Design a protein around this ligand. Structure first.
Ligand SMILES: COc1ccc(-c2noc(C(=O)N[C@@H](C#N)Cc3ccc(C(=O)N4CCC4)cc3)n2)cc1OC
Length: 277
């Protein structure tokens, strides 16, 4: 069921059949999280999951788009994701369109921009790490000494989190490799969003919109405390539909909330299959 970065959640028939749904992984999870959604979609809808790759959002989409084409040719493309996965689906839709492929549905499952832009500055790096330090002092009941701001600010997001994790592991017990790896890659995958270069898109985007980010998101980046009516997509997408779903971001992928998403998506897929026949 895993072939490189492609997971088969439901294999398509050998010939013809329904348009597959391509889903994209969240930060810190795999595409197994789309199983509840799969169960709310029509029977026999194929679903393939794209798992983690390295690079900027644009570079990741450059790895995905050739594989999408190998599996599905000229289209129709249905592209869906929650959280980071929505940003990935969108970057793949832009990429496919540039190659003239037929993208008919882009489903963003609470892929909502921070309500203020995240500055890419030294001052923001300082502020971020001071925040994080303060959370570490309270949670672990320690004092953190002066932060080495020069060292952090010459690093990208991966380098900063690596340097901090490596400092922690110079002292005391050896932390299992799986735990360090998961923390490092979840952090950098979430930070890859901040510098996404969002390009306008000329087709229909559907944004399933929760009420708010959960608290851990807001601790990670306080600008997720506020959200705009268009989730930050309006200037880029003229043909934007918002489907309110309630709850918190973290709950959007799970039952019961995923049932509203699935009910809606099923109607959209129904329309797509009708337009083919
Ligand atoms: C058009 O402009 C944009 C539109 C949409 C977006 C966007 N779409 O999706 C997201 C998103 O979901 N960001 C996640 C992150 N980062 C949220 C999150 C954070 C933290 C956690 C968590 O639980 N943590 C931390 C450690 C345990 C979970 C989710 N942003 C971005 C845009 O431009 C930059």
């Amino acid at each position: 069921q895993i072939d490189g970065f492609v997971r088969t959640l439901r294999a398509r028939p050998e010939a013809g059949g329904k348009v597959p749904v391509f889903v994209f992984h969240p930060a810190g999870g795999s595409t197994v999280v789309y199983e509840p959604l799969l169960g709310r979609l029509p029977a026999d809808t194929p679903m393939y999951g794209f798992e983690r790759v390295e690079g900027s959002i644009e570079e990741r989409a450059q790895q995905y788009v050739p594989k999408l084409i190998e599996m599905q040719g000229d289209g129709p493309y249905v592209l869906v994701g929650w959280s980071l996965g929505g940003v990935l689906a969108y970057a793949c839709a832009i990429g496919l369109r540039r190659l003239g492929k037929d993208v008919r549905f882009v489903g963003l499952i609470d892929a909502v921009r921070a309500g203020e832009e995240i500055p890419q500055t030294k001052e923001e790096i300082r502020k971020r790490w001071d925040r994080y330090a303060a959370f570490a002092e309270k949670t672990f009941n320690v004092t953190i000494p002066a932060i080495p701001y020069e060292q952090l600010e010459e690093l990208d997001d991966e380098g900063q989190v690596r340097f901090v994790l490596d400092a922690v592991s110079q002292s005391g017990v050896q932390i299992p490799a799986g735990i360090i790896e998961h923390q490092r890659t979840s952090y950098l995958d979430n930070r890859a969003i901040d510098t996404a270069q969002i390009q306008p898109y000329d087709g229909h985007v559907t944004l399933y919109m929760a009420d708010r980010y959960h608290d851990d998101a807001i601790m990670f980046e306080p600008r997720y405390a506020v959200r705009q009516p268009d989730g930050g997509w309006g200037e880029y997408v003229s043909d934007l539909e918002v489907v309110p779903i309630g709850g918190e971001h973290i709950q959007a992928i799970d039952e019961p909330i995923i049932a509203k998403v699935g009910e809606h998506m099923s109607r959209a897929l129904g329309q797509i299959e009708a337009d083919r026949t």
